Design a binder for this molecule. Sequence first.
Ligand SMILES: [Mg+2]
Ligand SMILES: [Zn+2]
Ligand SMILES: [Zn+2]
Lengths: 95, 50, 50, 1338
Amino acid sequence: SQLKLLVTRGKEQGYLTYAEVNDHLPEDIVDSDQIEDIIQMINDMGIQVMEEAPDDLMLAENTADEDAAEAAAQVLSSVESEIGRTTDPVRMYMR
Amino acid sequence: RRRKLPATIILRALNYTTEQILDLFFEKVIFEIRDNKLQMELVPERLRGE
Amino acid sequence: ETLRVDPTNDRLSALVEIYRMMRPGEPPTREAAESLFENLFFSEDRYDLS
Amino acid sequence: EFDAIKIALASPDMIRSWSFGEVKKPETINYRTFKPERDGLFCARIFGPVKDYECLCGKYKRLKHRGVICEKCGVEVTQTKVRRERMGHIELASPTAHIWFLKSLPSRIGLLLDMPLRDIERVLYFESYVVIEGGMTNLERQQILTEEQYLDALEEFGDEFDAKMGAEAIQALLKSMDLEQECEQLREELNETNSETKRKKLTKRIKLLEAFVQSGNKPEWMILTVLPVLPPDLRPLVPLDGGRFATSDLNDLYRRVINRNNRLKRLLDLAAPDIIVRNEKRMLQEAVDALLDNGRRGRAITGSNKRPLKSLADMIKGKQGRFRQNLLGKRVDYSGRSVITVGPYLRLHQCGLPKKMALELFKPFIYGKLELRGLATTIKAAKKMVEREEAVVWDILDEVIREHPVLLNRAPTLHRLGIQAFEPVLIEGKAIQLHPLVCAAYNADFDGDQMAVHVPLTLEAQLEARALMMSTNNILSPANGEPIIVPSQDVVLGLYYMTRDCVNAKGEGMVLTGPKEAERLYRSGLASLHARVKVRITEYEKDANGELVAKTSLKDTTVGRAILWMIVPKGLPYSIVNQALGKKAISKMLNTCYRILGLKPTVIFADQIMYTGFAYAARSGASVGIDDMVIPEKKHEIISEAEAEVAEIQEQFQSGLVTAGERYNKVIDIWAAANDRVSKAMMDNLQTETVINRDGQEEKQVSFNSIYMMADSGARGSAAQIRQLAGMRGLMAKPDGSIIETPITANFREGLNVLQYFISTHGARKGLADTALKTANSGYLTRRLVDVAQDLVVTEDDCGTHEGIMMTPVIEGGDVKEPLRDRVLGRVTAEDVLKPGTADILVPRNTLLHEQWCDLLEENSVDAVKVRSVVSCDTDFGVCAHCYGRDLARGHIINKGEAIGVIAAQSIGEPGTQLTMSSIQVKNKGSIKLSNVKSVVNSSGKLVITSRNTELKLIDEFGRTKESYKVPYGAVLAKGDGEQVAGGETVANWDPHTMPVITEVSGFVRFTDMIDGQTITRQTDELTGLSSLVVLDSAERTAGGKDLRPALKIVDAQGNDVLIPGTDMPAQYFLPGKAIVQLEDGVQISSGDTLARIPQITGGLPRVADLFEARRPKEPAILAEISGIVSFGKETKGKRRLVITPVDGSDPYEEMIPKWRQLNVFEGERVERGDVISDGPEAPHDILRLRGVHAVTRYIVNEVQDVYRLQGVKINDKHIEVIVRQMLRKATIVNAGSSDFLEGEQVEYSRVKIANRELEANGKVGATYSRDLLGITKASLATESFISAASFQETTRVLTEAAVAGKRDELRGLKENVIVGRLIPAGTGYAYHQDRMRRRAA
Ligand SMILES: [Mg+2]
Ligand SMILES: [Zn+2]
Ligand SMILES: [Zn+2]
């Protein structure tokens, strides 16, 4: 699962860009809301996925650091095993 | 700034085949093999850097 | 190397893949992909370099 | 009043008890007559009346009926303030999932039910079925069906198959759950079966269920059934002007939750088809989840403004919420602000204050005084009088102001001296006159800076602003004892100009008879202010026990010094005012006065110094002109020669004798040399230029050049800035970081042409940006530093311990960087200090080392003292006063109450804005001393040390260490050890290229187990014709001798292996790879020859932040866990496995040394724990685990203080140690001992210690623990008061965790009592808090 290595790369970089959080997504996700949910999950355990690469200004060290990390990781590792949006009450009614 | 896609996808989308893709960017190394001898259209420039 | 990484093989599949990359959820079509690709860069109404 | 805060889940019955009525309709107001609507969000009869003591009906409109409910509409006649505390409740048609307890991602509901978050999400959003009672059928509890399988099993069996969906199913699941039975069954399983995977998970689940059971909450309260609605006034609908209304977002959201709710009920009344009712239930769930926390999961609904509307979870959380309001908030009455000016006529305990700004701050006091003296009948007449400003109002104001101190503050309050208290002196203007000397504390300048004044109201506040915060009580910096009242720029110049001497001065040679005659001369116009004379001075000394004995003598001086001696207090020595008296001498004079006499004489002396300095700086008329910036006359020659050099190098490069990089470097070097030469020439021409002749030929003295006087006396300037004024500007940097090759070769007396100003501009812009960046980072550092340590408070008089740390002078690289007197002054000794011969008990073991004791210590050459330190203190929840030292701000000793944590954090953070990102040759006279030495005297007569920690110290005649140096392994020591030496004899010359395999015997070389071709490369150097049977690593040669050991050994001259003294192994050193074994077999050599020769940081705020955060460095120098003989096991994994076998203990230690790193441990060696094996940065964690608390504390203190002293900043050690105390305040239990502590767990060290103390007295054996080091950002996230932790952490997570666990917060910190509005437990309030303690202890 390239998602796990994406999380490790984000930890090693101290941050993740939107290009990074796009390249390593599953290639079968079509619904955007699932992408939003997974990026929110990553941000909850860290690291904040800003939209650009940005030296001597200290960033928030490890605010989202907690056991919540590993559990969050598990959630990510479980997102690839299945699929479903379920995040828009309009979409469920339409289906 | 949406997502990566192999840079040849658009080339195909522009109505270019794989042959056309290899033709536009890459040059050619033609072989005039006289059956045997593996006769190659070698040029001294190709040799440089080898 | 990019060609060896390219999953698609022809124009139709490439346009479908682009439509999936850009359009999050609507299934492909042999008119929808054409419209999206054309009216993104080559449309006189939605792309100006000046 | 109250004594604690308790938080827990709220039951539906509880919520119905809070509320005063159900909120049914969604309608707010009536849009024509703006009375609140009948039964909606703004309702009169639910949330009380609108107008004070007035029913909405309009019938009851008096204060007599108060308490009756108008039967016509039911509105209760009472205060409209009651419209700010009543709540309401909404009866939800169907249950709903409280989002906080679902999408928190430990998933409280998920943990409790043992269900993944996605499964419950499916069940809630109506896409599945969950079985609550499988029972007789095959299905089991918590088995998610699907819309097809459900009907399938219905066909199998209609009943016995309860499977609901939606929030109505999670509630049933949770209600059916029995916690005690499940935990019992989990215990049963845990005991019988034991596995790593199981035990941990099962124990954690048992802990969770027990925690929930003890909390008193029920599982199903996480599912809402009744929803509370906030009181109207907290979400108002205030009418703006023009008929336009303004409202807070909550109204919107509440409406969104009522409409849908009502609609749902209506559908249930019509028995609608279940598709639409499911959609309605999902909509209502979305509405509630947006109301509690908008945007948590579902793309927050947006208002008409297009912005995302806020919700209840954003009025608490967020930098803009009620929490974190103390980021910057709480405007304050009785306050003002204005610009500041100089006002040098003041004393340093009073400040000017405008009449207009003082008659406005003290209005209530003036009213009281007027109605007291009878000048005004009532208070209304008093207000009228004050507004007309009659004559008597000013007299009454002057009576009111007299003894009332007013606080003065400046914007960036970096340290506690930024708020002080002065006695107002009424001034007729509009600017706050601030005493000059105080400007240093505030860091204020008078170029437009503003200040804010606050008024203390009560009697306690007035007394505190007079005893704790007065400006005459804070003359010593809290970060170090050095005074903070040094006169700055005009008075130092005045005193420097007064206390000087000339060569032919009017009035030289006279013999005055005291200071008074010297003054009567200078003023009379008969002698110059600096003319060398003889004066009879009578100086006192308190050498006796408090008796000021006198001594009169004729001293050579200058009339200036004699005049200045008049203000000097009693028995200070005369030598204090016999010198040039720059900016250092004056501060030293003030410090000596403070340490000798006391406080009051010091403040009086400071005022007199200021007055005299200003007065005599005015007289000198020391102005600055364009003729004072004297250019050198040799500048042109120097620059021309430098140009010749650079042209020569450029020509050489054009001829291809150098690279572009080397041409650049050489040009830079020669231009730097030219700049240095020009600077030296200008300073030489500027300092002694004044040449004067006294009754004769000529004589050159120190110059009087106004610029030189201003720069030399310390007033303003330095060598660099004058060098820019008269010399050449020098070398300039460029955007990348490079330095432009050609320097600016002009000054500011001669203008810079167009091209050089561009480079100057780039430099200026970079500096301007950098200053803002610094000020941004320093604040962050100090905020984290106070967050970690804010509740530390001296809470005992003595802890009674004999621990401590061994203070010793710092000697790094060269000679002393800081003596022992500064590092030990004002710290309580832990154990008695003995003399060299030890002779006696010299210093008792609990003596505060003040100046006399430090001087006595330096009178016997002591260089090591075991002093008590905070980190090794012994009290719980505080620090013993003795264990801390003395209050460097007040001098005497720390008192019970001082909040040493906050002051330490401020002291460490304040200077943060100033920090910016071959052989051993003796240089002093002394005697040799090698420590940790095991050497062999080779046949060459030199010395090479076989030890690892060998180091060379220099010991004088007195015995004290003079200088320190590190002795490398294999270093050729021209000396021996402990012998004599003189400065000039290189003690040790060592080549860093070759690392020897030095042998211990001089005998035949022998290649045992050395197969050529399989364990050897047959190298042959054709230059010297050297046939080297070199040893390669285990990556190139074949498998024949793969693991074999190429053994270079020294045998005797006969052929028998020579045993190395000590063991049963001949000296067969096994060669590692790449060894340079030049000599082949058959040639005996000397003892200790190089047979086989082994071939070969940021300093700013980031460094301090990294140290305090305690992060693992990139290449941790590995350390030996357990002492013992070393060996290597497996190979080819990329990690040559290293093992240590103790002398007699077990040998389980193993590691995976990355082969990418080298090693300084030979295969055969018995290393000791805490010894370097590899090389690199030493992680603090490893130091703590191996060498203990003292080692880590010393490392952290010597790194941060190194960073600071690099820039000249002074900070005492107490502060860094108290910060390091709050890092290693957690322990990991190893052995459970006898108490009820888990095998592996992290607990606070205080609890462990009290438990062990209790056990050791009961009879059982104490527990075993190991301390742990944590950063300042992961240590503050351990606080045990959710009101504190919720103020700066993620509020939602803290609130949920506290709620489910049913925590009680008992206010015992400083943040908590600040938010709640009580007295902090730190200072004057400490006593009060203790009282409560005993009353509650009853
Ligand atoms: Mg200013
Ligand atoms: Zn009424
Ligand atoms: Zn102590």
